[PDB]
Amino acid sequence: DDTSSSINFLTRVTGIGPSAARKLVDEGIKTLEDLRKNEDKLNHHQRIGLKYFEDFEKRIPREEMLQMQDIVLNEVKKLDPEYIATVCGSFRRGAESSGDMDVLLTHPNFTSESSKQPKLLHRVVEQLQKVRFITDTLSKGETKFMGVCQLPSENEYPHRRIDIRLIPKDQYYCGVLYFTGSDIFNKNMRAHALEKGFTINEYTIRPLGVTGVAGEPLPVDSEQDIFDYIQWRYREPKDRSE
Ligand SMILES: [Ca+2]
């Protein structure tokens, strides 16, 4: 009922899961104003969320995405040029608006062999708060920063979720493809390759075989590379709606 109305609302707040949101109901926490008077009940995640309830619903215009992506990209150049940073999502695919900045990052330095270089992402984030670009954190791994950026005002913009993800360079491509999407594109891509005698995921591109159980990743220098394995004309990210 109109109470369920609640679990439905709360869940609107980031960090608030269903079971998570469920408890806030038992304690008698319902509206956001209920939230507000109870940060003490919230971990840091749910807290940033309520912070930016508003902003967190507006969408991201592309003019803005661009600006944001220039800043991210430039800084990363400064630290170490060997560093690669692709912005993914709808955005990469010409989308006119979007819901957040999704970044994929890698360094020749780190590969699926390494598996331990949080400083590599971290260095990346700091430069960013150093810049006043990132402005809050949501959570933060040794490989996946989750947070909240903000375009520089001249005088202001909304707060905006951003995610950085460290992926091995041997698995970056597959990874870039994946996060590019779109959903069905991925469905279709994987779909054909399976015909051409290959299996794919965000990590790799591997041959199939007898009984089907098989593998052993193939080399991937580019996104183009993957497409050649499957023998398709490389599809620009635009023509990827499916
Ligand atoms: Ca996202």
Q: Where do the structural domains in the chain lie, given as residue ranges?
A: 1-58, 59-172, 173-241
CB 132 within 8 A of CB 152: yes
**Second-level CATH architecture of 173-241:** 2-Layer Sandwich (3.30)
55-87: b or e for each residue (b if 16 or more CB lie within 10 Å)? ebeeebebebbeebbebbeebbeeeeeebbbbb
Residue 200 is assigned to a ligand binding site: no
In the reported structure, the alpha carbon of residue 103 is separated from the centroid of ligand 1 by a whole-number distance in angstroms of: 9
| Intrachain domains 1-58 and 59-172 with the same fold | no
Distance between CA atoms of residues 90 and 182, nearest Å: 7
CA of 155 relative to ligand 1 center, distance in Å: 29
* Residues 176, 182, 187: CA angle, nearest 5 degrees: 95
CATH class of 59-172: alpha beta
Centre of ligand 1 from the C-alpha of residue 102, in Å:
5
Asked whether residue 93 is marked as a ligand-binding residue, the answer is yes
Class of the domain covering 1-58? mainly alpha
Binding site annotation covers 36? no
Residue 226 CA, ligand 1 centroid: distance in Å: 23
Q: Is 143 annotated as a binding residue?
A: no
The first and second tokens of residue 211, run together, are 């009984």
Using CA atoms, how far residue 224 sits from 6, 183, 210, in Å, is 47, 19, 27
Q: How many whole angstroms from 88 Cα to the centroid of ligand 1? A: 9
Dist. CA 99 → ligand 1 center (Å): 7
Q: Where are the beta strands (DSSP E) in the chain?
A: 60-61, 84-87, 97-98, 101-106, 134-140, 145-149, 162-166, 198-200, 205-207
What does this entry list as its resolution, in Å?
2.7
- What separation in Å is there between the alpha carbon of 42 and the centre of ligand 1? 23
| Alpha carbon of 15 to ligand 1 centroid (Å) | 14
Phi, psi of 30 (to 5 degrees): -125, -65
Task: State how far the alpha carbon of 14 is from the alpha carbons of 44, 48, 146, 188, 216, in Å.
Answer: 11, 8, 12, 31, 38
